Structures are given as C-alpha cells and as structure tokens.
Amino acid sequence: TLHNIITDTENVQGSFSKHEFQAETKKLLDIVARSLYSEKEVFIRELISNGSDALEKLRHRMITAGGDTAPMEIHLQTDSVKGTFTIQDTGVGMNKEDLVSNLGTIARSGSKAFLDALQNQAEASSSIIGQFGVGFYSAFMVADKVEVYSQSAEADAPGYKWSSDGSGVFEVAEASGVRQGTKIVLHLKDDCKEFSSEDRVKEVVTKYSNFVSFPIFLNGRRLNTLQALWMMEPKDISEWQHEEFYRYVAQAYDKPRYTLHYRADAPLNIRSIFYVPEMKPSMGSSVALYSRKILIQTKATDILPKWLRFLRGVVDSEDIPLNLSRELLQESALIRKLRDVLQQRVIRFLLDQSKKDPEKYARFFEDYGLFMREGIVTTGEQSVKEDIAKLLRFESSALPAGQQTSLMEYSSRMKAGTRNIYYLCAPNRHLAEHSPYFEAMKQKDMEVLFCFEQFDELTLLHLREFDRKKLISAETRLSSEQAEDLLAWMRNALVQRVTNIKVTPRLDTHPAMITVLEMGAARHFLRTQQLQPTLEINTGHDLIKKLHALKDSNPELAQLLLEQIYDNAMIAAGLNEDPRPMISRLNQLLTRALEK
Amino acid sequence: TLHNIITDTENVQGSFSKHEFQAETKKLLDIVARSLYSEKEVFIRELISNGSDALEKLRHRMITTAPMEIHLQTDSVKGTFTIQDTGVGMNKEDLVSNLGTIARSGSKAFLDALQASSSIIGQFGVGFYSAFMVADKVEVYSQSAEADAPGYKWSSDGSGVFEVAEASGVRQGTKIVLHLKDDCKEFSSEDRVKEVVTKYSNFVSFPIFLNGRRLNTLQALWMMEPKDISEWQHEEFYRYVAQAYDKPRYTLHYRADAPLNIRSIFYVPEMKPSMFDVSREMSSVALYSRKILIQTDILPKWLRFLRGVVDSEDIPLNLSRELLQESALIRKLRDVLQQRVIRFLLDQSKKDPEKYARFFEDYGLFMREGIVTTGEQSVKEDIAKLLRFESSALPAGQQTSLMEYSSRMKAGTRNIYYLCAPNRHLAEHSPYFEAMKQKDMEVLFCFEQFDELTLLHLREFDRKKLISAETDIVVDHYKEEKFQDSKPASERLSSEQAEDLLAWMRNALVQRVTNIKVTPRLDTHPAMITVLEMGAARHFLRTILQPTLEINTGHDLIKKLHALKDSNPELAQLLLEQIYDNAMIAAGLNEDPRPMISRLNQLLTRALE
Ligand SMILES: Nc1ncnc2c1ncn2[C@@H]1O[C@H](COP(=O)(O)OP(=O)(O)O)[C@@H](O)[C@H]1O
Ligand SMILES: Nc1ncnc2c1ncn2[C@@H]1O[C@H](COP(=O)(O)OP(=O)(O)O)[C@@H](O)[C@H]1O
Ligand code: ALF
Ligand code: ALF
Ligand SMILES: [Co+2]
Ligand SMILES: [Co+2]
Ligand SMILES: [Co+2]
Ligand SMILES: [Co+2]
Ligand SMILES: [Mg+2]
Ligand SMILES: [Mg+2]
C-alpha cells in the first residue's frame, strides 16, 4: 500500500555553469542588526565585548613594543535629553582601512584573525571575545544613526569618523582630535530611549558584562567591582570570598554548605564553582554559563543533568562552541561529554563529603535527597543510576534507630553466598518492624533496608539493580475466655474501622498497638486525608482488664475508653500525627472517668 | 570623585567618502552550517517548510488539480536524505538567485506582492543552507511551471561555488538529495526522520509521505473556529499536545486580536496532578508559528498544570527560529493569559460548582502557590477569587468564596474572619468558633493544610483585613469587649475559687506558659491556648512560645480539677498536664504527640477505679 514518487529518473543534459555564492547585502545587514538575539539590550554586551577585545589587543602589543602606559578602560555615557548612548575604549583603535574593512564588511572579524595568528599559549588567546564579525551591527537595532570615532596607535595616523544610518551605506571622513582608541555614539530610536537612562544601562552591564577584565565606567562612575572568582587558583580564595561570591551568583543571603571549585582542560577548557546552599528548598536561581567572562546563559541548559539543578554557581568555558546569538550552545559531542564529566565530578565530590563529615552530609541528604531520587528515576543509563545511588542513605534492621547506611555498606555485610538486596519501604520504624513481611526474614537472618522517605519506593523500583546485585521488596493475664469475650465485643464496636483484632504477649507498657501488612496501603492512607489495620491487645495491661470489666458496667463509657485505646495505638504507629479529631471525645472520657 | 574621559571634542576635517557594506560570503556560509541552529535535526524542519511554501505558491497559482504533497526518503545504505515536493519548482534564474544568494527569499518577495495569504513560512532566505549542517554534498533537481522551461540540476558542497546544469527527467516541483556527512548518519534512519517531522512539522497543511507511507498529520485546532471543534477533537488534540492518555476536564479555547494577536488552547487534565511531577522541572505549553513548532515563560509558574498551545503573530522570531524576541511583549502576553485563565476558571465555578469543587480539590495547591509567590497585591487578590471555603453562615458542605463573603458584610464592618480546622465538624465545634459565636460576624471555614499560610500571605482582600478567629480572641482582651459566660454564675467556680485554682496552675506549669487566665467565652471546652500570632506560630512549627492558657470555670473537668488539687494532688497534676496538652493539640501547636501517650495511659488507669 505504498505511494512514493521519488524515482531515480534525472539525467544531466548539456554542459554545466559555475557560480559563486552571493549575499543580499542590504537585507543581511537588517537580519544581522535585528534578528539574531532574544533582546535589543544586548547591543551593550556586544559593544563592551568589542572594547574589551580592543584593550586586550593593545595589552598584547605592549608585551613587545612597550609604549606609554595609558590606562585601559571602557567608559559609557548616557544623555537623557538627546537620547544618546556613547561608549569609549582606550584600546587599539582602527585606521581608515580597518574601519572600512571591519565595520563595513558583515562577518569580517579582525579579532578572529588576530586570535588565529597568536601563540596558543598567549594570554590573549583565551580572553578575546569576538568570532563572527557581526556583533557591532546590533547597534542598528536601537539606533537611527551610529557614529564611530577612531584613532589607531600608529605612524601618526589621522583620526577618522565612520557613520551610517544602517541602510546599506556608510561614510568615512578624517577627524580630530580623536583620542587613541574608539568612541561610538548611538542616536537612540524613540522606542529605545530607555538606553539613555543611567539605571537601565547599569542593569544591562551588570547582567552580561559584570566580570569583564577592564574597568567599566558609567557617567564617570565605576561599575564592575567584582572579580571573576572562577578564574582564580582554588587556594588563593578565602572562605569569605566564596561566601560573598555565592551570595552574589545565587542572589542569596545565607552561605554555601558545600563549595566545589572545578578546573580542567578536557574535553573543554573549564573554570567553575558550584555551591550547595545552607538553606533548603523551596534570576540567579541556577548555575550560569559564561565564556571568557561574558554571560552566555543565566540558566545553563546543556551542561548539567536536571537532577543537579539545586547547585548554584558558574561554569566558564573558553572554547565551548557558541551559537551565533551568544545565548545558546551548539549541539556538540564535547558539550555532552562535559555534562557526563561534571555529573561524575559532583557525585565524587558529594561522596568525599559523606566521609569527611557524615553528620553534615546527613543534613545535606535530608534536604536535597529528593534530587538524587529524581535523578535515579529519570535517567536511562543504568550505570548512571548506580552512580547517583551511592549518595542514597537509608536505615536498617541490623542497625539502631536514626543510624544511617548506604547500599555499599549493606553490600559489604552480605554473606558471599546470597547476592540480592532486600528493602522495605515504610512510613516509619514501628510500622516496618512489625511488618509480617519483614518478620519473615527476621528469623531467616537477613538484613533489610528500611526506607522511610518519600519516593524511596519507586526510586528502588526504577533502580532495579545495584552493584550487579538485585533489589527486591520484602513483600512477596485475663484467662483465655475473658479475653475472647472482650475480643468478640471490641470486634463489634470497630466493625467499620479495623479488619482484624488479635492478642499479643510482646506488649509491655502499651495496652494495644496497631500493625499493618501492606506498606503501600499505609502510604495511600497517609496521603489520603482531606487501609486495613490489625490492632493487638495486651491482656496483662490495666486499661484492657479495666476495659473488659467496663463493657458490662458502663457500655457507653467503655466505648469512650475503647476508641481512645484505638486512637492511642494509631498515634503510636504514627498513623495519626494530627489527633485534633479525638480531643473533644477524650475530654468527655476524662470527665466521666472522674466521678471522684 | 568622578572619572570620565568622554568629551565632545571631535571635529570632521575635509570631505567624506561614501561606501557600501559588503559581506564575507564564505564565512557566512560557514556560520549558517555550524553556528546558526543550536540543533542539527532542524534542517528537516527547514526543507519541509520550503516544500510547504512551494506548494502554497502553486495552490495560489491554480486559483488562476495535480496532487500537492511532500515526500521523504531515507537510504541508510547510500547515506542519503531525500525530500521532494510537487510544488511551483524553480527556473534557472530562480535557482541561481534564490539558492545562490544568502538572504534572498523568493518566498518573501511573493508575500510582498500579495496586496489569503498567511501560510507562507519563509522570510529570511537562509533556511536552505541548513542542509550543510548535515551534508557535505547537496543536489537539487527542479522543474518550473509550466512553462516551456527545461529541468535543472543544482549541486554544491556548501563552500564557495555551485553548478547548474540542464536535466530531462525532472518532475514538476523540486527534489533535494542530501549526501549525509559521517557524523550525521542518523538522518538516514526512517524512525529518526519520522521523530523530527512529528516534532516540528506535524501541522504542515500538505500530506507528507515518508518512504511511501503517509504520515498522520494533524489539523491546527488553535487556528480554527471554537464552534467547529467537537469534544472528541479536543480529546484527541489534548492527548497529542500533552502526550497523555486521559482526557481534559476543562478546555479553554482563547482567541484575541487586541492588544495582541493570540490563538491558543489550554487544557486541564482529568487526571490529578502527579505529586512527584509537581516537584520536578518539566514546557507545559507549546509555542507555534504558521503551524510550525518553536522550541520555547509564556504562563506564570502557578499555571504550569495547564497543557496546550499558544500562537502569536506578534512574537518575532530570531534567525534560527528558536528564540522569541521582545521580552516585554511576552510578559504582556503572559499577563493577558493569566487574567483570561482566571476569568475562565471563575466562569467554570458558576457553570458547575460541583465539578469546580473537584478541580479545586485536585489543583487548589497551584492557586495557593501563585498567591504566596507573587509580590503584586492585585494579582494575589485576583488568584484568590479562585479559592473556596465553607462558612458559618451556610449549610455544611456548601462552598463559598471571598467575594460572596464580602457581599454579605455590613457597611460598618472592616474585617474578614476565618478559621482553619481539618474539617467542618471541627470548625463548627472549635473552642475558637464558640468564642466567635458571641459576636455577629460570619467566619470562613478553611480545611486544607496550607489555607492558613495562603491567607497570611494574602493579608487583605477587597480592602478588608483578613483576621483569624484565634487572633481576634487575643485582641479582644485588650479591648473593653464585654462577654458573658454561656453558663450562669451558679454553675461556675466562685471568684475566690478561681484565683486559688489559677495560682496552683501557675505553680504547676511554671516552665510552659506565659499567662493562665479565666475566659467567659467557652462552653463545651475546658480550656484553650491563645497566641496573638497563631497562624504564624502554626507555620513556624515545621522543624518555645508565649502561649496563654484560658480556662472555662463552668466546665465540669475544670471544677473537678479545682477539687482534685486538694483531694488527690498528684492526680490533679497529671490531669493538669493533660488538659494543657489537649489545648495545645486543639490549637494545632503540638509537637509529635507520641510522648504524650504513656502519660495519658497512666492518667487514664489512675482515674478508672
Ligand atoms: N571598539 C573597537 N575598537 C577596535 N576595533 C573594533 C572595535 N569594535 C569592533 N572592532 C573591529 O571590528 C570587527 C567586527 O566587530 P564585531 O562586528 O563586534 O565582530 P566580532 O565578533 O569580531 O567582535 C572586530 O573583529 C574588530 O576587528
Ligand atoms: N522546494 C522548493 N521549491 C521551490 N523554491 C524553493 C524551494 N526551497 C527553496 N526555494 C526558494 O529559495 C528561497 C530561499 O530559501 P530559504 O533559504 O529556505 O529561505 P526562506 O525559506 O526563508 O525564503 C525560497 O524563498 C524559495 O523562493
Ligand atoms: F561581534 Al561578534 F562574534 F563578537 F559577531
Ligand atoms: F528558509 Al527561511 F526564513 F524560512 F530562511
Ligand atoms: Co543516473
Ligand atoms: Co595557533
Ligand atoms: Co560635534
Ligand atoms: Co452590602
Ligand atoms: Mg563583537
Ligand atoms: Mg525556508
């Protein structure tokens, strides 16, 4: 039942023509000026990156041809009356040829050609921003008219003025007295007047350009007072520096409980700092992606797994393949490898923390454990599930209350014969301990992990196996007649509440206790509060004898006592942490009990 | 104190020269192939869109019966991707100018000459070079219509040059063959190509066949008349866009032209939301343009339970068609969508309060989140219109709202009174509600665990302060409010007996309480605990205070406590400690009640003799 029209029927007739690809220059200028970026305001990032590069080139040239130490800076000036934005740098400048060539040719990048000719070890290799040779045109998105004044450091070259409205044509004339470097004046469009506002420009500078190497001045005032901490040697950074830097990058007010300062060169140049905040859950609300100190993404997308989104901080890579918009990354095996690498690194880091300070790590796991569980559930690589699962903490049968263990430790206590991992996911200890399913493998000496946390169950279900070992849920006085009179009677006043009633000798201080056979039911019971309980009675307890003796004497009163015993055992089993519904009834019981 | 170097000092000398902008063509070709689109797969979207526009131009020509379709073929042996449309094709002069010139768009010129149509996708004139992301060799065979014009073959590797030769076996339309580079062989996989078509091009208005098998393309319901869409079509469409297996319980089909062009559909699933999924970062609403998916914010976070689709002709796209421009217009769209959704939900409440109660029960948490996390007061109140409560002035089970509460208020009244309790029996028989019965004010009854937090953050509604019953009771102590006991004097402890009891209680509870006082405001309860800022105290208890214990000297238990303190003083203390614990529980201020149990068991035994 196929329908295909694609058939190999074409044959070349005659001789071929040769052509070269062309460009619709005027339309391309418009696309490059207006259609590259998600935001107009990005022309400021672009113009500042250009000033930086101009300064970096001058710095590079002074290594050999030492000149006059002139200060290396980027000045911005707003004029809210005229509607102008002006930026000036004291860098390398541009003679007439270079203005014509660099500014007049779409995609021509003098910075890229400069980079290509460097020693790979030159400091400038890693800090020159420009590649594509189009960022300058972003100015035309916000300006009706652009004027560029430039003076090169040269053979007494004259200064020049370059000017365009941005519609296919530009003009060049000689000028004086242009200071060494480059001044750019934007005459802002009516709908872009906000960029002649000081406060608005400041917002943009701090967003994208806050860690630019060279001093930025706005109307004569210094902005970028913050050092790119990630580019520094880990041991030259004090804890107070991290605390301040964390607060800044995470927009937080507390301190990091964990700090990881990760540096490496393969698969990419990476300089990074990750923080785990002190404060628990529930814009600066994730790890930012930088490149050569310029923000790429406020919220980095492709470099960390989703389960690590609770990390704050910064990743900077010099050689990460940038999308043309410079707010996205290109699809790349190197970026994928980076994510895998970072995932392993953070895992290793958190593991080391568990050893160094287990108590502190326990606090961490209580607050952030949900992310590990999420990671294990949502990832498809079995090897990855098992790496994240090393971070997991549980409780155990062969261990005291409150004390925690990992799967590896459990794995270390398994007799070399049997090779599978038994767990019981339950609301609490009392419920887990008194599980008939657990009582089975209590006699059969067999350690069982008690998993009390939310989503512990499907975490292990989605985990399936660990350490090539299998995880399987462990779910596969008063005479004797006086008691039976009582049990027959209690079984009637709670017909609509409990499936089963028993007697047990294992009770001491308690008149009764509640047990459950299905942990999944108790959870369904625990979350459903806008079950088949099985209470057991202590025939030696006073309240129970007092009950038996009372059902005949004060039938009304004896049922107050009964429901109290039931509710109390319910509370002991942690199946009723909000006993507000019982209080009035209890106050009635107490009162009737006290005809003293 | 200031450091500037910018000064108006520059002056032009002599004449100027004029210049035309130029382009580094070769590097531009490279930028389109390596740096324009963030994902490689997208070349499929680009070629199919081209095929769609070519068919659209032919469809337009035919106004003044040949099959209009788009065919795809994958050969994993030859490593080829092939697309063929039966559209308008291209002549020599069209082949050279359109394909041979970066930013030249035949499609755009077509649209500019149409002074419907609105279905043409192409404007930038670069989408075609996306083929070089994945192929080191491209062949194009085209046949113009009709027009006594021969076929042609166009060929290039994507660097610098291309060749155009004349050909004979060329069908009306256009055939393009990609010889896939080695790292891109996945696009010779039928299943992979199909994934991509479905992803971006599922609403293209022409049949798409892949290796001879017709793909199940869908109608773009969001662009169609609401009345021409059955419940069944919504069901099916909902299942596609939400990748779900259930059906929508609500459907909002929203169309507007001012202030902004909008074409959208939102659904609320019949399913309860997954609590696991509520905590994940999962996005919920897809964004389209001319029937083509855009990979991208649009809805406030609290509306993330909504599924469906938004399309707006006012959202301009970046060159690679994956970034939305004008972030102020987006927030504006977001603001408009938020308000339209609130209106819709309010109307659903009116239409069917019983169905809305189930919605509020399943999704109420999202409104509560929205109110707590927004800073704008007017936004808080608008969302709060969606909240439901019960009332002391309405029958049990009957739901009401803040606006109906406001509507029943007297002119003189400046407050909205509320009480948080787990259910209506507890609210109605609360010691705190007993106290409020002595005034003539209505009291909202709020049963959900986070209702109180929500009302605390909301703070006021319609210029009226929200006040909890518990708070009001404390405030009355500092006001000359006269209350009378619901039991006559005969049945209460004498003043002298009360002071004596009170003195003994202050001694017996030195550690635990600030004040112990008599209250004339209880009936069936022996005592209560009061705290001025009760709400905030309950919320703070999430991993002591200055509480006050207030006693009902008309309550038999309290009078028995007065007697016990002299007749069996040790039993009195255990009774006193339990009364205090009970009032703490009743106040929702108790810690883990488990250590109270053995104490109570001892107390019970000791009393039953
Ligand atoms: N302020 C400046 N000073 C000196 N040269 C500049 C300046 N701004 C831009 N240029 C030159 O113009 C070229 C094009 O700038 P732009 O379009 O931003 O492309 P790029 O991506 O290379 O920065 C640069 O590579 C550089 O050679
Ligand atoms: N399959 C096709 N049939 C006919 N003409 C085409 C086809 N694909 C591309 N073209 C022509 O080449 C032009 C350039 O295509 P493209 O680079 O995709 O830019 P856009 O689609 O944005 O115009 C199109 O506008 C169209 O005129
Ligand atoms: F200005 Al650029 F890449 F830095 F186009
Ligand atoms: F192919 Al286009 F804008 F659709 F360049
Ligand atoms: Co052949
Ligand atoms: Co080199
Ligand atoms: Co002047
Ligand atoms: Co009125
Ligand atoms: Mg640049
Ligand atoms: Mg196209």
In 3D space, the residue among A519, A520, A515 whose CA is nearest the CA of residue A502 turns out to be: A515
Which of the listed residues B387, B414, B431 is the one where a domain comes to its end?
A: B387
Write the CB contacts of B13 (distance below 8 Å, at least 6 apart in sequence): A158, A173, A174, A175, A176
Please, are residues A119 and A168 in contact by the beta-carbon 8 Å criterion?
A: no
B114 and B231 in a single domain? The answer is: no
Calpha distance B524→B431 (Å, rounded): 8
Report residue B116 as tokens.
Answer: 């419907």
Calpha distance B530→B551 (Å, rounded): 11
Main-chain dihedrals φ then ψ at residue A400, nearest 5 degrees:
-70, 165
* Strand partners for B162: A19, B156
**From edge to edge, which strands make up the β-sheet containing B70-75?**
A12-20, B161-167, B151-156, B135-143, B173-180, B80-85, B70-75, B208-210, B213-214
Which of A440-471 are b and which e, b meaning 16 or more Cβ less than 10 Å from the residue's Cβ?
ebeeeebbbbbbbbbbbbebbeebebbbeeeb
Indicate the top mutation candidate among A45, A131, A295 to test ligand 3's pocket, ranked by most ligand atoms within 8 A of CB: A131
Write the CB contacts of A335 (distance below 8 Å, at least 6 apart in sequence): A268, A302, A303, A320, A321, A329
Instruction: Choose the mutation target among A11, A18, A38 for the interface with B, i.e. most B CBs under 10 Å.
Output: A38
A17 located within any domain? no
Beta-carbon separation of B35 and A132 below 8 A: yes
Shortest Cα distance, chain A CAs vs residue B101, angstroms: 5
Positive or negative CA dihedral for B290, B295, B299, B304?
positive
Half-sphere exposure of B573 (CA within 13 A, CB side): 6
* Strand partners for A405: A394
A574 and A538 in a single domain? The answer is: yes
Calpha distance A260→A246 (Å, rounded): 11
Half-sphere exposure of B297 (CA within 13 A, CB side): 18
Instruction: Give contacts of A 278-297 with B, CB under 8 A.
Output: none
A193 and A203 in a single domain? The answer is: yes
Side chain identity at residue B315, one-letter code: I
Pick the residue whose CA is nearest to atom 10 on ligand 2: B50
Calpha distance A559→A580 (Å, rounded): 19
Calpha distance B137→B180 (Å, rounded): 7
* Strand partners for A147: A163, A185
Which of the listed residues A169, A190, A225 is the one where a domain comes to its end?
A: A225
- Count of positions (residues) in chain A: 596
In 3D space, the residue among B598, B572, B608 whose CA is nearest the CA of residue A558 turns out to be: B608
Calpha distance A307→A311 (Å, rounded): 9
Beta-carbon separation of A593 and B578 below 8 A: no
Which of B530-539 are b and which e, b meaning 16 or more Cβ less than 10 Å from the residue's Cβ?
bbbbbbebbe
Which of the listed residues B363, B387, B411 is the one where a domain comes to its end?
A: B387
A174 and A321 in a single domain? The answer is: no
B224 located within any domain? yes
Q: How far apart are the first and last CA of chain A?
A: 94
- Look at chain A and report how many structural domains it folds into: 4
- Residue B450 three-state SS: coil
Calpha distance A96→A173 (Å, rounded): 9
Positive or negative CA dihedral for A247, A251, A252, A258?
negative
Calpha distance B369→A440 (Å, rounded): 45
- With 0-12 / 13-18 / 19 or more C-beta atoms within 10 angstroms meaning exposed / middle / buried, residue B407 is exposed
How big is chain B by its Cα radius of gyration, in Å? 37
A1 belongs to an annotated ligand binding site: no
Please tell me if the CB atom of residue A112 comes closer than 6 angstroms to any atom of ligand 1: yes
DSSP one-letter code for A306: G
Shortest Cα distance, chain A CAs vs residue B39, angstroms: 5
Task: Give residue B463's region: left, alpha or beta (phi > 0; psi -120 to 50).
Answer: left
Give the H or E element holding residue B267.
strand B262-269
A248 and A386 in a single domain? The answer is: yes
In 3D space, the residue among B288, B329, B323 whose CA is nearest the CA of residue B308 turns out to be: B288
Q: How far is the CA of A12 from the centre of ligand 5 (A)?
A: 9
Query: How much of chain B is helix, strand and coil, in % rounded to 5?
Result: 40, 20, 35
Main-chain dihedrals φ then ψ at residue A322, nearest 5 degrees:
-80, 135
Cα A242 versus chain centre, distance: 18
Calpha distance B28→B102 (Å, rounded): 8
How big is chain A by its Cα radius of gyration, in Å? 36
Q: At what angle do helices A542-553 and A555-572 cross, to 10 degrees?
A: 150
Side chain identity at residue B45, one-letter code: R
Task: Give residue A550's region: left, alpha or beta (phi > 0; psi -120 to 50).
Answer: alpha
CA B364-A369-A344 angle, 5° bins: 130
A18 located within any domain? no
B462 and B606 in a single domain? The answer is: no
DSSP letter string over B368-409?
HHHHHH---HHHHHHHHTT--BEETTS-TT--B-HHHHHHH-
Please, are residues A102 and A195 in contact by the beta-carbon 8 Å criterion?
A: no
A8 located within any domain? no
In 3D space, the residue among B389, B422, B421, B420 whose CA is nearest the CA of residue B406 turns out to be: B389
Side chain identity at residue A55, one-letter code: L
Calpha distance A128→A111 (Å, rounded): 7
Please, are residues B499 and B506 in contact by the beta-carbon 8 Å criterion?
A: no
CA A432-A435-A437 angle, 5° bins: 120
A377 and A428 in a single domain? The answer is: no
A30 and A96 in a single domain? The answer is: yes
Cis peptide before B56 (omega within 30 of 0): no
CATH number at residue A581: 1.20.120.790
CATH number at residue B343: 3.30.230.80
Which residue pairs, CB below 8 angstroms and at least 24 apart, start in A542-548?
A542/A511, A542/B605, A543/A511, A543/B601, A543/B604, A543/B605, A543/B608, A544/A478, A544/A486, A544/A511, A544/A512, A545/A477, A545/A478, A546/B605, A546/B608, A547/A486, A547/A490, A547/A511, A548/A478, A548/A482, A548/A483, A548/A485, A548/A486
CATH number at residue A441: 3.40.50.11260
Cα A8 versus chain centre, distance: 52
Calpha distance B492→B123 (Å, rounded): 88
In 3D space, the residue among A537, A541, A525 whose CA is nearest the CA of residue A577 turns out to be: A525
Calpha distance B317→B32 (Å, rounded): 16
B263 and B376 in a single domain? The answer is: yes
B4 located within any domain? no
In 3D space, the residue among B38, B42, B209 whose CA is nearest the CA of residue B131 turns out to be: B42
Please give the C-alpha separations between residue B290 and each of A440, A505, B318, in angstroms, as whole numbers.
64, 75, 15
CATH number at residue B201: 3.30.565.10
Please give the C-alpha separations between residue A270 and each of A301, A315, A317, A319, A590, in angstroms, as whole numbers.
16, 7, 5, 9, 70
Calpha distance A315→B82 (Å, rounded): 40
Q: How far apart are the first and last CA of chain B?
A: 88
In 3D space, the residue among A329, A397, A389, A107 whose CA is nearest the CA of residue B102 turns out to be: A107
Please tell me if the CB atom of residue B308 comes closer than 6 angstroms to any atom of ligand 4: no
Indicate the top mutation candidate among B46, B130, B132, B317 to test ligand 4's pocket, ranked by most ligand atoms within 8 A of CB: B46
Calpha distance A95→A413 (Å, rounded): 76
DSSP letter string over A198-244?
HHHHHHHHHHHSTT-SS-EEETTEE------GGGS-GGG--HHHHHH
- Residue A197 three-state SS: coil
Half-sphere exposure of B420 (CA within 13 A, CB side): 22
Which of A117-138 are b and which e, b meaning 16 or more Cβ less than 10 Å from the residue's Cβ?
eeeeeeebbbbbbbbbbbbbbb
Nearest to B102 among A23, A220, A306 (CB): A23
Residue ranges with strand state E in A410-516: 420-425, 449-451, 465-466, 469-473, 500-503, 512-515
Structure determination method: X-ray
DSSP letter string over B137-184?
EEEEEEE-SSSS--EEEEEE-SSSEEEEEEESS--SEEEEEEEE-GGG
Please tell me if the CB atom of residue A50 comes closer than 6 angstroms to any atom of ligand 1: yes
B210 and B224 in a single domain? The answer is: no
Which residue pairs, CB below 8 angstroms and at least 24 apart, start in B425-429?
B426/A580, B426/A581, B427/B390, B427/B392, B428/B392, B428/B396, B429/A584, B429/B524
A93 belongs to an annotated ligand binding site: no
Q: How far is the CA of B531 from the centre of ligand 6 (A)?
A: 73
B8 located within any domain? no
Calpha distance A159→A174 (Å, rounded): 6
In 3D space, the residue among B140, B209, B205, B193 whose CA is nearest the CA of residue B171 turns out to be: B140
Please, are residues A148 and A184 in contact by the beta-carbon 8 Å criterion?
A: yes
Calpha distance B286→B294 (Å, rounded): 8
Range(s) of the domain holding residue B56: 24-218
A15 located within any domain? no
- Residue B50 three-state SS: helix
Please, are residues A572 and A434 in contact by the beta-carbon 8 Å criterion?
A: no
Q: Does B322 touch chain A (CB under 8 A)?
A: yes
Please tell me if the CB atom of residue B121 comes closer than 6 angstroms to any atom of ligand 4: yes
- With 0-12 / 13-18 / 19 or more C-beta atoms within 10 angstroms meaning exposed / middle / buried, residue B410 is exposed
A414 and A380 in a single domain? The answer is: no
B410 and B383 in a single domain? The answer is: no
Which of A545-580 are b and which e, b meaning 16 or more Cβ less than 10 Å from the residue's Cβ?
bbbbebbeeeeebbbbbbbbbbbbbbbbbbbbeebb
Calpha distance A142→B39 (Å, rounded): 29
B337 located within any domain? yes
